[PDB]
Design a protein around this nucleic acid. Structure first.
Lengths: 555, 418
DNA sequence: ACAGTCCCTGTTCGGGCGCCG
DNA sequence: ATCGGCGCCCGAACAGGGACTGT
């Protein structure tokens, strides 16, 4: 493949900077003879030119084995040059997903050979890619070269080749507007609805078209028969699946190992329904030691069994039909954990996924359901460019009473109710009017800002009072602690009057779970009660029982 | 025609905003628009060596089927240099009409040294293709500098019409031309068509509205009547009997309102709650307290004195979800010194889409700020960041985009709607 | 009115996964 | 050891802003 005739992209250094001047570090003897042998080859191939003392820049060079290949990959530690290269706007905005592929009669996956080594580099920038090959004998000075093509490891190479490949495909795509070509780096998914004979004719026109542009499509990387290995998937004519996932088996695990296990489990959740990682990610909390060994908790081990259980059965995905409606259904598995499947025909999932983010310290299931619907909505726009219809495990009246009573603007797109327990519910509901015949509790709490000690108590209309001393607390916690006392020392119906907007805004939001132990205790009391009315009054205004309890806790 | 030199503010780089996902409906509309803009030399293809980007998306035009390409030039406008009188009578006119004259900007070329900053990227479904990047070669719609650079040309086009109709107020803000008059609605719409055709001798306007008899839900933001905008007073309940809980809600409400109205007092009302009573206990208002309440009702009815608009300070607008499709808003520059307090209700849908509601209220509040002060406010939105961002582009129809931030408000602002 | 502490929310970066050179 | 660009997840440091409090 002679160097492509595409125009070089003008590349500059950051303003007021010079090129890299890094000396070459030692290399092993297997790599020294290979880099010299390799460098004269890729000078002969034209990718590299010799340079003289006029070039004052340098970058260390080494040579590692190519990824899953017998060929050697020539790599340069361009960490110093990358810091000085101008910034780019990456045109790769995401990764194509098979669930967005439509059905096609004929499919071809190509791969360009020596991709970066086919695209020329801007002439003005070539001086800064200078490097030196140190000889074996330290007495020899070493041979300096500069780069004429896109180096592997340079920060601009991926973006420029992606931009260059689109320019190379633009004329061919225009000469044949009905052939779909999914372009990611050098790998080309070509799909058409023509007959199988005429389709192979167009592939050769493309290979010849790319060959004219210095882009070889080697036969070793040319796939013509299903199954297709594309973007880490195994593509079949009517079904798609992920290339085999290998979960490691070890008797003792470390932090790094856990980090790998979480990652592979996330990668599997796109098609395997029911993957859970909350308890496995909890083991990654606090420890930044990558080689630290972590004992699996009782809850963590249970989580691994569930995932392995659903991984023994093969799962497949379906392709997308633009004529048929898009459907997504969500189920509540664990606390703060959700799994979903997007399909068109029931039990024929296009893809799956999971949402398990705890947004906020205080939340409920209805909030998380709206958060999971949004993650799916955005994800559906990326894959299919449209919003799916929803099937949610929440009652129609449950949502109607929530969004009408919530102070923030919340909305859910077109959705239908599915009776897949456990359902999402509001566990308690605060009264809109004070309860008649209910003991009125005027609660408050205080704390010193230096001492961190505080009080929390209440006074009632029935004359009942209480004050509890607390150690290692804050103002916000003691005021929350006072509301907890009134719920403890009251019947099933209680009126509570507080002066804390912070405690009021948390409770009024009807949370069912919280990172704070105290809030979970307050939530639990509200579910046990039958009617609760919570009122707020401005503090330090001589109002009702608020004034009596304020003096009780401030002393 | 030579381009006007444009600089960024000292020490600031160009915009670098990622492109957000778009529906196939919007991408296919955008691809057609940008391909046509490149043919007419209005935009041109660029590569990844341009490190700047500005988000782009599409909106359906007002009472029309055509699509309008919208650039999120908020970041570029914040970093663009400042250039170099607002008609106070425009808000007094009976009828005011908003004309999209952004199409006129596409005739003036842009300074080459500046074009790198107008870059945007069109995404592709399922990431089939890399983003195709374009930059602008002419003055772009939605750019802070476009109306300024075109300012000399706009006064020239309008001067004959403004002397032929001296009773018509014409204000310009970004792509929009605000035309206000006191004529009757029918003679006013003819005058708008008179301005459109007299303008047509120089620059084009959006395809004439497929309707002309104000089809409901369609001319909300088109044909505006400023003389019917109403302020939302703060109200207090009127009951024959007040309870301890009712007096506490009253005292808390009045104490908050004393920050907006100076004379609010709650002392004789707080005296009624001096015990440690039950919430449902009825408290008779003493003769002293009845007067204090009656005086607070009077204070909230009279307008606030000594609150004037400062053109150097930014405008801020806050919206509260009051329920039943009703939304309250306040526009101010300093805390508790409101420049206007309004209410919007019965917006779009039979009160189903909350987000559609909030989006319309934000547009109507901004329109009022442009008409009243010629500025746009910064919004404090009562919505989750992701809930808005996901859907707001689906209901936006203005040529400008105001700045906003997201807040989680405690439910103690019942001080604006009864 | 100024300057702190608490709490919450969001942004950025670190790890992992995956793709490609 | 010893690289580039993208997307995603999850965890944690830092900052911002608004409320309470103490001076």
């Amino acid at each position: 493949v002679p160097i492509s005739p595409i125009e070089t992209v003008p590349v500059k250094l950051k303003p007021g900077m010079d090129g890299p001047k890094v000396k070459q570090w030692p290399l092993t003897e297997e790599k020294i003879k290979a880099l010299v042998e390799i460098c004269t080859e890729m000078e002969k191939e034209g990718k590299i030119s010799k340079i003289g003392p006029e070039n004052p820049y340098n970058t260390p060079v080494f040579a590692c084995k190519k990824k899953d290949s017998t060929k050697w990959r020539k790599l340069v530690d361009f960490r110093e040059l990358n810091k000085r290269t101008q910034d780019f706007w990456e045109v790769q905005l995401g990764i194509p997903h098979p669930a967005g592929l439509k059905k096609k009669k004929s499919v071809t996956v190509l791969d360009v050979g020596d991709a970066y080594f086919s695209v020329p580099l801007d002439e003005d920038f070539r001086k800064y890619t200078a490097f030196t090959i140190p000889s074996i004998n330290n007495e020899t000075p070493g041979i300096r070269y500069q780069y004429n093509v896109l180096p592997q490891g340079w920060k601009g190479s991926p973006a420029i080749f992606q931009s260059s490949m689109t320019k190379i495909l633009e004329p061919f795509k225009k000469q044949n507007p009905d052939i779909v070509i999914y372009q990611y780096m050098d790998d080309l998914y070509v799909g058409s609805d023509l007959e199988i004979g005429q389709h192979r004719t167009k592939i050769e026109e493309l290979r010849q078209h790319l060959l004219r542009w210095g882009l070889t499509t080697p036969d070793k990387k040319h796939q013509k028969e299903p199954p297709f290995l594309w973007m880490g998937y195994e593509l079949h004519p009517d079904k798609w699946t992920v290339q085999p996932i290998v979960l490691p088996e070890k008797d003792s695990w470390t932090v790094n190992d856990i980090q790998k296990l979480v990652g592979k489990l996330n990668w599997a959740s796109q098609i395997y329904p029911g993957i859970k990682v909350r308890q496995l990610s909890k083991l990654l909390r606090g420890t930044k030691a990558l080689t630290e060994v972590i004992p699996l908790t009782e809850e963590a081990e249970l989580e691994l069994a569930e995932n392995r259980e659903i991984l023994k059965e093969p799962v497949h995905g379906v392709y997308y039909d633009p004529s048929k409606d898009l459907i997504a259904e969500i189920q509540k598995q664990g606390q703060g954990q959700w799994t979903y499947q997007i399909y068109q025909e029931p039990f024929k999932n296009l893809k799956t996924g999971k949402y398990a983010r705890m947004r906020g310290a205080h939340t409920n299931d209805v909030k998380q359901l709206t958060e999971a619907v949004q993650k799916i909505t955005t994800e559906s726009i990326v894959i299919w460019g449209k919003t799916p219809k929803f099937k949610l495990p929440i009652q129609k009246e449950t949502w109607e009473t929530w969004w009408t009573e919530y102070w923030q603007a919340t909305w859910i797109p077109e959705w239908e109710f599915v009776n897949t327990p456990p359902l999402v519910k509001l566990w308690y509901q605060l009264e809109k009017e004070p309860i008649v015949g209910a003991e009125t509790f005027y609660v408050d709490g205080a704390a010193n800002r230096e001492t961190k000690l505080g009080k929390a108590g209440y006074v009632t209309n029935k004359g009942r009072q209480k004050v509890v001393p607390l150690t290692n607390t804050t103002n916000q916690k003691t005021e929350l602690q006072a509301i907890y006392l009134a719920l403890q020392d009251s019947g099933l119906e209680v009126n509570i009057v507080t002066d804390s907007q912070y405690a009021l805004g948390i409770i009024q939001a009807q949370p069912d779970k919280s990172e704070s132990e105290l809030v979970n205790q307050i939530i639990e009391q509200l579910i046990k009660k039958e009617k609760v009315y919570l009122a707020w009054v401005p503090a330090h205004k001589g109002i009702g029982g608020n004034e009596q309890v304020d003096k009780l806790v401030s002393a | 025609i030579e381009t006007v030199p444009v600089k960024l503010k000292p020490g600031m780089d160009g915009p670098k905003v990622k492109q957000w996902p778009l529906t196939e409906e919007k991408i296919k509309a955008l691809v057609e628009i940008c391909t046509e803009m490149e043919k007419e030399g209005k935009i041109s293809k660029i590569g990844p060596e341009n490190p700047y980007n500005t988000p782009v998306f599409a909106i359906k035009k007002k009472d029309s089927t055509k699509w309008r390409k919208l650039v999120d030039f908020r970041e570029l406008n914040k970093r663009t240099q400042d250039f170099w009188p607002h008609p106070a009578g425009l808000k007094k006119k009976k009828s005011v009409t908003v004309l999209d004259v952004g199409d006129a900007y596409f005739s003036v070329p842009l300074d080459e040294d500046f074009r790198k900053y107008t870059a945007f990227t069109i995404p592709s479904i399922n990431n089939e293709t890399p983003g195709i990047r374009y930059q602008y070669n002419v003055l772009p719609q939605g750019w802070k500098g476009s109306p300024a650079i075109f300012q000399s040309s706009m006064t020239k086009i309008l001067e004959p019409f403004k002397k032929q109709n001296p009773d018509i107020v014409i204000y310009q803000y970004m792509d929009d031309l605000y035309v206000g008059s006191d004529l009757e609605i029918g003679q006013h719409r003819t005058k708008i068509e008179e301005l459109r055709q007299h303008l047509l001798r120089w620059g084009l306007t959006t395809p004439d509205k497929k309707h002309q008899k104000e089809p409901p839900f369609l001319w909300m933001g088109y044909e505006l009547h400023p003389d019917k905008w109403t302020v939302q007073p703060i109200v207090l309940p009127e009951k024959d009997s007040w309870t301890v809980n009712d007096i506490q809600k009253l005292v808390g409400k009045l104490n908050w309102a004393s920050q907006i109205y100076p004379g609010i007092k709650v002392r004789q009302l707080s005296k009624l709650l001096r015990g440690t009573k039950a919430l449902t206990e009825v408290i008779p208002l003493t003769e002293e307290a009845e007067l204090e309440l009656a005086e607070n009702r009077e204070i909230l009815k009279e307008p606030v004195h000594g609150v004037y608009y400062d053109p150097s300070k930014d405008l801020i607008a806050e919206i509260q979800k009051q329920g039943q499709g009703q939304w309250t808003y306040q526009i101010y520059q300093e805390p508790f010194k409101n420049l206007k307090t309004g209410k919007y209700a019965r917006m779009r849908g039979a009160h189903t889409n909350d987000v559609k509601q909030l989006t319309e209220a934000v547009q109507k509040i901004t329109t009022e700020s442009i008409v009243i002060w010629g500025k746009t406010p910064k919004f404090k939105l009562p919505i989750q960041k992701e809930t808005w961002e996901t859907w707001w582009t689906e209901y936006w129809q203005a040529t400008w985009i105001p700045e906003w931030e997201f807040v989680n408000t405690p439910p103690l602002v019942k001080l604006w709607y009864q």
